[PDB]
Amino acid sequence: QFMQNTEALCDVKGFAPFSKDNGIRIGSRGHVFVIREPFVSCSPTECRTFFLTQGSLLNDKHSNGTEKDRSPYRTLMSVEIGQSPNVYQARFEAVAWSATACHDGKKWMTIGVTGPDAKAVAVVHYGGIPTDVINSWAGDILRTQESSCTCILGECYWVMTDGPANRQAQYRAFKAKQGKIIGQVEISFNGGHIEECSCYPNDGKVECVCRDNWTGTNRPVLVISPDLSYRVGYLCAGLSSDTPRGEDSQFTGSCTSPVGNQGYGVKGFGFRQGNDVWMGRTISRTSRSGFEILKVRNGWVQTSKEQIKRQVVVDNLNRSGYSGSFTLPVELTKRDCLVPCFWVEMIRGKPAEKTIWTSSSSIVMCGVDHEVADWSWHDGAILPFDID
Amino acid sequence: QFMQNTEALCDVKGFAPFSKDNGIRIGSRGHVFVIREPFVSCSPTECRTFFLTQGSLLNDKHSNGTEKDRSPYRTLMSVEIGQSPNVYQARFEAVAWSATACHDGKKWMTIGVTGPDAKAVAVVHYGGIPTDVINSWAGDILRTQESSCTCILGECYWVMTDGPANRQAQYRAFKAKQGKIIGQVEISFNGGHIEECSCYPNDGKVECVCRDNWTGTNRPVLVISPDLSYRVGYLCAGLSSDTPRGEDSQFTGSCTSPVGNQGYGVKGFGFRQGNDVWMGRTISRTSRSGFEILKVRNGWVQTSKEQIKRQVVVDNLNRSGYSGSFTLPVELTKRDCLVPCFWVEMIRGKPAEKTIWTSSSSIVMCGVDHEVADWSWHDGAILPFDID
Amino acid sequence: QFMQNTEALCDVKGFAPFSKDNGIRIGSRGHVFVIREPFVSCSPTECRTFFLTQGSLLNDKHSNGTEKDRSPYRTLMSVEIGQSPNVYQARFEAVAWSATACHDGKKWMTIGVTGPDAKAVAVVHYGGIPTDVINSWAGDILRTQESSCTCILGECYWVMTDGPANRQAQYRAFKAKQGKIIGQVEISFNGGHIEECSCYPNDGKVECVCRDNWTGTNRPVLVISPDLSYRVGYLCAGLSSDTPRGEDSQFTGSCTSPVGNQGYGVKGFGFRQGNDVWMGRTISRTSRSGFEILKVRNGWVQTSKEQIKRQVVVDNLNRSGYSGSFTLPVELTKRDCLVPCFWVEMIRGKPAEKTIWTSSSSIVMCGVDHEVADWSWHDGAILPFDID
Amino acid sequence: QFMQNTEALCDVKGFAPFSKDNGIRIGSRGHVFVIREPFVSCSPTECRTFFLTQGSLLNDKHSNGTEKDRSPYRTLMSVEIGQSPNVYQARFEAVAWSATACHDGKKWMTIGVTGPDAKAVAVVHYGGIPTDVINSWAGDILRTQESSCTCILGECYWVMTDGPANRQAQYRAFKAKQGKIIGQVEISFNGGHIEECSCYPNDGKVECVCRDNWTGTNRPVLVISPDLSYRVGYLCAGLSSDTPRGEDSQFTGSCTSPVGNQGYGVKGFGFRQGNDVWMGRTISRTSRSGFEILKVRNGWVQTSKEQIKRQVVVDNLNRSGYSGSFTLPVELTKRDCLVPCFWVEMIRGKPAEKTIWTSSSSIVMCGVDHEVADWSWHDGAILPFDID
Ligand SMILES: *[C@@H]1O[C@H](CO[C@@H]2O[C@@H](C)[C@@H](O)[C@@H](O)[C@@H]2O)[C@@H](O)[C@H](O)[C@H]1NC(C)=O
Ligand SMILES: *[C@@H]1O[C@H](CO[C@@H]2O[C@@H](C)[C@@H](O)[C@@H](O)[C@@H]2O)[C@@H](O)[C@H](O)[C@H]1NC(C)=O
Ligand SMILES: *[C@@H]1O[C@H](CO[C@@H]2O[C@@H](C)[C@@H](O)[C@@H](O)[C@@H]2O)[C@@H](O)[C@H](O)[C@H]1NC(C)=O
Ligand SMILES: *[C@@H]1O[C@H](CO[C@@H]2O[C@@H](C)[C@@H](O)[C@@H](O)[C@@H]2O)[C@@H](O)[C@H](O)[C@H]1NC(C)=O
Ligand SMILES: CC(=O)N[C@H]1[C@H]([C@H](O)[C@H](O)CO)OC(C(=O)O)=C[C@@H]1NC(=N)N
Ligand SMILES: CC(=O)N[C@H]1[C@H]([C@H](O)[C@H](O)CO)OC(C(=O)O)=C[C@@H]1NC(=N)N
Ligand SMILES: CC(=O)N[C@H]1[C@H]([C@H](O)[C@H](O)CO)OC(C(=O)O)=C[C@@H]1NC(=N)N
Ligand SMILES: CC(=O)N[C@H]1[C@H]([C@H](O)[C@H](O)CO)OC(C(=O)O)=C[C@@H]1NC(=N)N
Ligand SMILES: [Ca+2]
Ligand SMILES: [Ca+2]
Ligand SMILES: [Ca+2]
Ligand SMILES: [Ca+2]
């Protein structure tokens, strides 16, 4: 039986710690993969942590980062949520330097994108084998979520980008059923930029909160229906959630336009909560450091700056990275609704830190019906390592 | 089908060795987690060893114990009983520096407590995901068993503490059904102190034998019914079972009062045997060393000092630690009754020993119908290690 | 239920990357077996990577290659496709310095050949145990595919050789049902030489494209029917696919005769595509380096040199090795046809490279309905290693 | 459903190599347990290799053999046949310095014996938990097979010894059903000595071929019926199969008496083959080196020295050790009969070799319907190791 995921997303008051894998700590001595872009996604039986290795291990000569962010050795693998991304526990998924995965109730789907910059190949797997391919249509680093995709009535949905890092690119959503792409849509968004979407199911549609890497310190929101009609705009809330971003007191929300006058960004998430929203961001507006989650009243519908909750997960003295959304299935929680959860990546090493390598660890939070007190579940690795 | 666990506890004449994981020995070269508080608990299919890592490994720089007894890196994981708590065999359970786990016949429940001292969060998991949360209610190191909890008719029971280490604190029991707390009770015990309970099912109720960390060299007994009425007092037997404790010939039992004029303690267990009892304690009254089990006649009901059996499991030249209770399910043993078993932790390293780290190994004994001869299944690691 | 595999092979326009295990890279620090001859084969549930260890690990003193290409320590093991051939993930199959494996829909069959050169023993396993034996019939290095065998209606088929490396030998096919050899045929091929066949099912027969190690720069084709009648000849296409081979513009195809005036070779594959063919070969005509796949029009039936597609998988600056064929089952793909896939081995170390050891890694491609752009998924290990 | 194992043992013409785990080779760099006494036994699904660790690893300081042959750290564990006895693949069975295991069709039974020399405890496990205990009855190193026990109609049978190494001891057989000892028999054998039996099912009875450690260079045979009546005597064949033993031309068989004038021995096996026998022995009469198997005509019933087959498995330049018997179940082979198989242990290290440690590897042979050529599948580890 295929997962419905047509339930409303639960309205959540705080987030409880789910897991912490301590990858880098363990990887000081154990045999753990160098990774980046480690997202969480769930089947009806288990939550798995997916990650992109660089085909090398921590504390090995091959972790040296003379290589490309995309390389031939990179692969998408997985472990049960909470395990480190270690060699001996790892499930191979796809060849990939960008990916998305998600379970339809019967099987894992997975899409790893690899090949050259000018002509990337994304390969859909299903049941553990290649079932379909989507080639670069715009010739410039075909790419996708680096977080969970989203399946609704046994059909699966994901967002990809192809084009410039730093100016107008091109954006499609895809629709798959059992590893066969049965539909796509070209997403009109001129002046806006979309990458790395964080998507989750809500009341029968896919909702995404993505990264604008061109002009905007606010994140695009893309809401896609089963049949592929969509709405695109920006996160309405009167707070900024990208980094780098400006001050809060320097910032006016927009439902329709990137605001703030900066490039770059980072991947992140957020959850529609009726008309409200929970929105993650780094505590530093200049760096990938600290992580907070902010609940804003009416922030999904209006340029509100009514904050009603804030909850810190990583302190501003400690590294963070990417963050992304996912939901717990009803077959696991037995609820009326879909439980929202996020992961945070905690990037360690060069250039920030004086090592030859760069990796990432993670912690996973989930929505609960009781507020939850601040703390920091940071990465905690003592750098530099022996190989350095 | 949910486990009944309404059977009487079997009356046992001695204990047979079940397992020995040799964690520290193996961890001299293999990749094994630094741990403490490793308890045993069983499902209808298997017995698992749960433990709290410190997010580091043996013989790695991160085992250095500049960290807190509670830290952000600590997690609850598990392995099949008898496996070392090694990276590659480990099942992630919860983020935790204190925990309890137990199986209801369908799934594992688990509760890991983490967060700051002033405002801890305990998160109930069920089927491998967060299902509920109980925040610190008294603001001072929310905490629980570090041994198996107890499920009876698909409902699960555990004891937590919140408050001072060394004076009056506050004590609640909780009742869960499929990871949802459906009931709690505030345990009146003025002048007495309760932590780290060792609990097991017996004739339809939970029985616990706990740690008093304030005034008492005798252990509290808490017996809790399905509907959460309870009895609380002290282990009646005319022997002391905490450490530090006084002499035996200096000691008068009490059913109602801590006796002996000392603080601190250690976690331990014991089994009601009709009106008799089996009671573990360290052989040293001053240190966490050696381990014995003593059967006392009428010791559960009267301040008896009629010892009828004694069985040594670790010699007084060798380190011990915590001990705790659990039962074998009827689906595994095919008996009329619930088989009592205990584990013992064998704590190695600083401050006792000259190393940077501190860990724990374990051995597991179970009740059998034949007396069993003394011996020592001590930890056996040659210290100090290379990292030292 | 036994697999049919009576479907036609799908007509494929390009090949998508399936996996990359990065064995040697990972094996720089992780505990990975030294191997050679790593082929892929699939069951109705999963694709597995099989390989022949040399009973030693990477970066260990025992990888020193004073040993024989065939030795007593060599064994056939397996891992899920994409895992490195690491100790802790490895499934033991057979004792072997040559092997073939394949799934009949119920169980894995496997045949490992071991023993002395003059009197080898090949042992058929089935369900994970020895079920039958075929001894050397010609006294000179009994041997077989080093790739997947082929089961059709619950019956399994494989090709072996016994005789000289470099002159006329002797060639049998075998037919097994549930690990019991129920039929064999002596393959008349005077002047031709056959080793290491790459075989796959197509329209109810086994098709193979093999290695001639005596006179021929073209590969033999052997097509075997259920009842063991066969056709044998050479790959008709007007391109050469062995190495070492001559120039393309120096080369005339033959359906019936080895052409090109050289010894040695390498194992490789190819796919009948109606009357066309896909044919792998190394890009270097002198060395085991680079890997391409070429589609030739009418190349299965005529000495065509009409190339219609070419796709590079490993660049001519990088090592390759063996290649072999396999198909995805219908129980996995849900197609009308059998999906063709190949693996490539990427041999590293001595004598080519200045190390004491020699190993192999792999990448796996599969047939898809969209052309696919060139790139190189080479092995990427920085040599020499520490043990060197 | 419980296994019958009431079929006659198959009449076998040679033995084919089944597995080779290369434990010591792999253990030079990988994390593998120091072990001794590694036997094979099978369930309806799989063959497992059981072994007794010394709670330490290869190439670790703890492999130093200042310890006892029996120690507190020793444990019985298992791996799938062919895997090395490595930490990360190992299944914990029992605490043990002597053991026996065997599957009844539903579950594994296992008996590990531990505790002091003067008062050993043997603990029966079943389904992965302690179910029963047999204490030392004669006060002198209670002990058992170190090979597979034997279950017939869901009932299980094993032989133990208690008493002197080197003079008259005492010998019982036990009968278990689902981990509960339901019967035992005291085995009258005055002047004879019995240890370490190698037992297998045949035509509804247990047959064993054991070790006499007192006076006899011939092995005792014990045949035990379901209801525990038994026959005991010696291997009739006119060849000797213990080591140390005398010359063959110096030796007269006996059905009833130890012959040859020596102490010590080694564990080994043999198979009734109608009236004939296959009998293993070391090739050296003075040392644990080389291994052969000999088929003797009428050798089970008469003091025959008609040898009809011989097959070498390990050469006389290479170390051997213990050997033992087991059968493949009908649920795996689909035969009319029970397939005989043996394992051989290949003991490496001190005192023989200049190291601090001592371990064992293994190879497994099985009976097949075709003669099989000589060779040597010896252990192949280059000694001494780094820790030495
Ligand atoms: C890390 O790698 C550094 C740069 O290496 C050089 O450039 C790369 C692209 C390769 O071509 C490499 O083979 C070249 O040597 C080295 O300078 C440095 O030694 C490395 N450090 C360590 C610790 O391995
Ligand atoms: C163990 O750690 C000792 C104390 O470290 C110092 O204090 C802690 C809290 C950290 O701030 C650490 O970074 C500081 O240096 C060290 O003195 C000692 O070097 C360590 N020993 C080993 C073997 O790693
Ligand atoms: C690799 O092995 C080389 C050759 O070893 C010699 O010949 C082989 C067949 C054995 O008999 C071996 O024991 C002999 O010493 C050695 O010369 C060399 O030391 C080895 N290198 C390493 C790094 O182990
Ligand atoms: C191996 O062990 C040798 C003997 O050790 C001594 O006696 C044993 C029973 C223990 O008491 C031990 O602690 C004593 O030192 C040592 O002489 C030797 O150093 C050891 N060798 C290695 C390589 O560890
Ligand atoms: C395909 C690709 O390389 N994606 C990048 C991503 C990218 O640079 C920007 O979004 C520009 O398009 O940035 C980052 C990043 O840390 O910012 C990591 C991702 N790395 C990987 N997914 N491997
Ligand atoms: C929550 C907490 O830190 N619990 C402690 C416990 C505690 O110090 C006393 O019981 C005072 O309340 O003591 C000990 C101890 O060894 O005595 C270990 C436990 N460590 C862990 N559970 N991590
Ligand atoms: C049985 C055997 O040793 N087969 C060889 C094979 C062989 O040398 C030629 O085909 C001549 O018959 O060559 C090669 C090779 O790389 O060319 C590897 C194979 N190695 C292994 N299969 N182990
Ligand atoms: C219980 C015990 O220690 N059994 C011994 C066994 C024993 O010395 C003789 O049979 C005398 O009774 O000998 C040997 C041996 O190699 O000869 C190994 C066994 N070691 C272990 N099973 N651990
Ligand atoms: Ca931006
Ligand atoms: Ca106390
Ligand atoms: Ca050739
Ligand atoms: Ca003898």
Q: Give the CATH number for residue A163.
A: 2.120.10.10
Q: Is A30 on the interface with C (CB under 8 A)?
A: no
Q: Which of residues 270-329 of D touch C (CB under 8 A)?
A: 328
Helix, strand, or coil (residue B61): helix
Chains that touch A (3 or more CB pairs under 8 A): B, C
Backbone region of residue C167 per phi and psi (left: phi > 0; alpha: psi in -120 to 50; beta: other values):
beta
Task: Establish whether residue B69 lines the binding site of ligand 6, counting it when its CB lies within 6 angstroms of any ligand atom.
Answer: yes
Question: Is B361:B329 a contact under the CB 8 Å cutoff?
Answer: no
Is it true that the peptide bond before C164 is cis, omega within 30 degrees of 0? no
Rounded to a whole number, what is the largest CA-CA distance in chain D?
53
CA D83 – ligand 5 centroid, Å: 41
The closest CB to that of A123, out of C16, C45, C380, belongs to: C16
The closest CB to that of C29, out of A59, A120, A131, belongs to: A59
Q: Is B384 on the interface with D (CB under 8 A)?
A: no
Task: Establish whether residue C64 lines the binding site of ligand 3, counting it when its CB lies within 6 angstroms of any ligand atom.
Answer: yes
The closest CB to that of B129, out of A14, A88, A333, belongs to: A333
Question: Is B7:B285 a contact under the CB 8 Å cutoff?
Answer: no
What's the gap in Å between the CA of D324 and the closest CA on chain C?
A: 18
What's the gap in Å between the CA of C222 and the closest CA on chain D?
A: 29
Residue carrying structure tokens 């293993």 = D280
Return the residue in B56, B59, B67 with the most chain A beta carbons within 10 A, the one to mutate for interface testing: B56
Question: Is B47:B40 a contact under the CB 8 Å cutoff?
Answer: yes
Q: What tokens does A128 get? A: 């553990």
Encode chain C in three state secondary structure.
Answer: CCCCCCCCECCCCEEEEEEECCHHHHCCCCCEEEEECCCEEECCCCEEEEEEEEEEECCCHHHCCCCCCCCCCCEEEEEECCCCCECCCCEEEEECCEEEEEECCCCEEEEEEECCCCCCEEEEEECCEEEEEEECCCCCCCEECCCECEEECCEEEEEEEECCCCCCCEEEEEEEECCEEEEEEEECCCCCCCEEEEEEEECCEEEEEEECCCCCCCCEEEEECCCCCEEEEECCCCCCCCCCCCCCCCCCCCCCCCCCCCCCCCCCCEEEECCEEEEEECCCCCCCEEEEEEEECCCCCCCCCCEEEEEEEEEEEEECCCEEEEEECHHHHCCCCEEEEEEEEEEEECCCCCCCCEEEEEEEEEEECCCCCCCCCCCCCCCCCCCC
Q: What tokens does D28 get? A: 């030079």
The closest CB to that of C128, out of D47, D86, D369, belongs to: D47
CA distances from D169 to D166, D192, D240 (A): 8, 9, 22
Of chain A, the end-to-end C-alpha distance in Å amounts to 50
Total count of domains within chain A: 1
Return the exposure string of A66-99: e unless at least 16 CB atoms fall within 10 Å of the residue's CB, then b.
ebeebebbbbbbbbbbbbbbbbbbbbbbbbbbbb
Whether B155 has a binding-site annotation, put simply, is no
Say how far apart CA B41 and CA B39 lie, in whole Å. 7
CA C88-C92-C98 angle, to 5 degrees, is 125
CB-count burial class (<10 Å; 0-12, 13-18, 19+) for B252: exposed
Q: Residue D330: which H helix or E strand, with range?
A: helix D330-333
CA distances from B28 to A102, D57, D61, D71 (A): 39, 9, 8, 18
Say how far apart CA A101 and CA A94 lie, in whole Å. 10
What's the gap in Å between the CA of D161 and the closest CA on chain C?
A: 32
Task: Establish whether residue C295 lines the binding site of ligand 7, counting it when its CB lies within 6 angstroms of any ligand atom.
Answer: no
Say how far apart CA A214 and CA D40 lie, in whole Å. 65
Question: Is C87:D86 a contact under the CB 8 Å cutoff?
Answer: yes
Ligand 5 pocket test, pick from A68, A69, A119, A141 with the greatest ligand atom count within 8 Å of Cβ, gives A69
**Pairing between β-strand A91-95 and β-strand A75-80 as defined by DSSP bridges:** antiparallel
Nearest to B338 by CA among B223, B224, B198, B203: B203
| Ligand 2 atom closest to residue B388's alpha carbon, by position in its atom list | 23
The backbone torsions φ and ψ at residue D270, rounded to the nearest 5 degrees and listed phi first, read -175, 160
Say how far apart CA A149 and CA A141 lie, in whole Å. 19
- Nearest residue by C-alpha to atom 15 in ligand 5: A266
Q: Is B83 on the interface with A (CB under 8 A)?
A: no
Count CB neighbours of C251 within 10 A: 18
Of B126, B157, B322, B379, catalytic: B322
Whether C67 has a binding-site annotation, put simply, is no
Give the contacts of B274 (CB within 8 A, at least 6 positions apart): B11, B300
Say how far apart CA B41 and CA B52 lie, in whole Å. 14
Of chain C, the end-to-end C-alpha distance in Å amounts to 50
CA C224-C228-C234 angle, to 5 degrees, is 30
Question: Is D345:D361 a contact under the CB 8 Å cutoff?
Answer: yes
Say how far apart CA C224 and CA C206 lie, in whole Å. 5
Q: Which residues of C touch D26 (CB under 8 A)?
A: 31, 55-57, 87
Q: Is B131 on the interface with A (CB under 8 A)?
A: yes
Residue of B nearest to A20 (CA): B95
The backbone torsions φ and ψ at residue A287, rounded to the nearest 5 degrees and listed phi first, read -125, 160
Cβ D20–C95 below 8 Å, yes or no? yes
Q: Is B196 on the interface with A (CB under 8 A)?
A: no
CA A323 – ligand 9 centroid, Å: 15
The closest CB to that of D25, out of C31, C55, C116, belongs to: C55
- Nearest residue by C-alpha to atom 20 in ligand 5: A69
The backbone torsions φ and ψ at residue B184, rounded to the nearest 5 degrees and listed phi first, read -150, 160
Say how far apart CA D112 and CA D97 lie, in whole Å. 7
What's the gap in Å between the CA of B195 and the closest CA on chain D?
A: 29
Return the residue in D22, D86, D326, D336 with the most chain C beta carbons within 10 A, the one to mutate for interface testing: D22
Cβ A86–B87 below 8 Å, yes or no? yes
CA quadruple A227, A228, A233, A239: dihedral positive or negative? positive
Say how far apart CA D372 and CA C123 lie, in whole Å. 11
CA distances from A168 to A161, A171, A189, B173, C277 (A): 11, 10, 9, 59, 43
Task: Establish whether residue A212 lines the binding site of ligand 5, counting it when its CB lies within 6 angstroms of any ligand atom.
Answer: no
Q: Which residues of A touch C42 (CB under 8 A)?
A: 129
Resolution limit, Å: 2.0
Which technique?
X-ray
Helix, strand, or coil (residue B176): strand
Say how far apart CA A135 and CA D307 lie, in whole Å. 70
The alpha carbons of chain A give a radius of gyration, in whole angstroms, of 19
The backbone torsions φ and ψ at residue A62, rounded to the nearest 5 degrees and listed phi first, read -75, -10
Say how far apart CA C112 and CA C124 lie, in whole Å. 7
Ligand closest to B220 (CA) is 10
- HSE-CB at D315 with a 13 A cutoff on CA atoms is 13
Question: Is A322:A266 a contact under the CB 8 Å cutoff?
Answer: yes
Count CB neighbours of D229 within 10 A: 10
CA distances from A187 to A142, A300, B366 (A): 15, 21, 65
Say how far apart CA C8 and CA C163 lie, in whole Å. 34
Task: Establish whether residue C261 lines the binding site of ligand 3, counting it when its CB lies within 6 angstroms of any ligand atom.
Answer: no
Question: Is A177:A154 a contact under the CB 8 Å cutoff?
Answer: yes
Q: Is A330 on the interface with B (CB under 8 A)?
A: no
Return the residue in A129, A136, A357 with the most chain C beta carbons within 10 A, the one to mutate for interface testing: A129
Domain interval for residue D341: 1-388
Question: Is C197:C174 a contact under the CB 8 Å cutoff?
Answer: no
| Ligand 5 atom closest to residue A321's alpha carbon, by position in its atom list | 16
Cβ B25–D90 below 8 Å, yes or no? no
Q: Is D354 on the interface with B (CB under 8 A)?
A: no
What's the gap in Å between the CA of D109 and the closest CA on chain C?
A: 21
Ligand 7 pocket test, pick from C50, C51, C69 with the greatest ligand atom count within 8 Å of Cβ, gives C69
- Nearest residue by C-alpha to atom 1 in ligand 2: B64
- Write out the catalytic residue numbers of C: 69, 322
Nearest to B172 by CA among B153, B194, B191: B194
B369 noted as active-site residue: no
Say how far apart CA D208 and CA D345 lie, in whole Å. 18
Q: Which residues of D touch C119 (CB under 8 A)?
A: 373-374
Cβ B72–A370 below 8 Å, yes or no? no
